[PDB]
Design an enzyme around this catalytic site. Structure first.
Site: not given
Length: 107
Positions: A26, A36, A82, A99
């Site tokens: 991924y 990120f 988060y 993702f």
């Protein structure tokens, strides 16, 4: 909230279950398209038991929608990630994750 989207079809059969060792390449990018995280850059397949609560809630929930061999986009909601906390040093608070998951193999 979380809105996993099919990219390319898998077997169309074996969805993730409790206790299965999910295995995926991924990458992880923000809403902006800024990256990120990459599973591949490591070239190591990523492995996680599902329902183990070892991951962010959106990852724990939305991967289950995927079929084996499927490629899919996880546009996980920050609350399922988060969220307001944010991932310190990486993900700013209140940021939907995106993702490019590929479910290599349930195990």
């Amino acid at each position: 909230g979380v809105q996993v989207e099919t990219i390319s079809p898998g077997d169309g059969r074996t969805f993730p279950k409790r206790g299965q060792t999910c295995v995926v390449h991924y990458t992880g990018m923000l809403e902006d398209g800024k990256k990120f995280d990459s599973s591949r850059d490591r070239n190591k397949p990523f492995k996680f038991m599902l329902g183990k609560q070892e991951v962010i809630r959106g990852w724990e929930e939305g991967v289950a929608q995927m079929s084996v061999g499927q490629r899919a986009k996880l546009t996980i909601s920050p609350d399922y990630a988060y969220g307001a906390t944010g991932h310190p040093g990486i993900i700013p608070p209140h940021a939907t994750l995106v993702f490019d998951v590929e479910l290599l193999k349930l195990e």
